[PDB]
Symmetry: C2
Subunit: 88 residues, 2 copies
């Protein structure tokens, strides 16, 4: 179904980005930035400044380790979906 | 992108199911049951018993109003994705 498709897309995109460098299970700042810029260009403004990279991670980073893990990525997804859900 | 596709699929599926009866913004038990049975047949066992319908809603229903709203649907999605994410 389309829902099952969306579930595996969420898994797949996190993984193409998280596995690039360092911890293959977490998104560092440069990997988060590339995900947003390449994969969310219709929902979010392109990130061009280091201070925005820094602030975005600061916001997503619930447990405070400096990176975005899968659960944190999932909360980020829920935020965008809710924002899109109620624009309409 | 495939991620933006997944975001709009999440919105769309909740809405086709929630708007069927009563509150057009919330999933009652029969609407939740149909969503899981029709749209999650590869991830979850088909629900055939009222006690399972009752227990599933009890689990998803964080604020205690007897129905599943959008934020609660989003937490349910995060649970299935995490379960699927780490099966592999
Ligand atoms: C082509 C679709 C564009 C039409 C549209 C839209 C729209 C309104 C608000 C958002 C959005 O996702 N923002 N996310 C935020 S503010 N951060 C969590 O997206
Ligand atoms: C065709 C794919 C089947 C292969 C597979 C798989 C798989 C393992 C675990 C789950 C799952 O989503 N369970 N969700 C639960 S337990 N409730 C929150 O799915
Ligand atoms: C070694 As690689 C292509 O996952 O950065
Ligand atoms: C009136 As209807 C087709 O949204 O249940
Ligand atoms: Ca990484
Ligand atoms: Ca973190
Ligand atoms: Ca309803
Ligand atoms: Ca509820």
């Amino acid at each position: 179904s389309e829902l099952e498709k969306a579930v595996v897309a969420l898994i797949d995109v996190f993984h193409q980005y998280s596995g690039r460098e360092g911890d293959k299970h977490k998104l560092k700042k440069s990997e988060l930035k590339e995900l947003i810029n390449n994969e969310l260009s219709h929902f979010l403004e392109e990130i061009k400044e280091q201070e925005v990279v820094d602030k975005v991670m600061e916001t997503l980073d619930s447990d405070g380790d400096g990176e975005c893990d899968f659960q944190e990525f999932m909360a980020f997804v829920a935020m965008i979906t809710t924002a899109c859900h109620e624009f309409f």
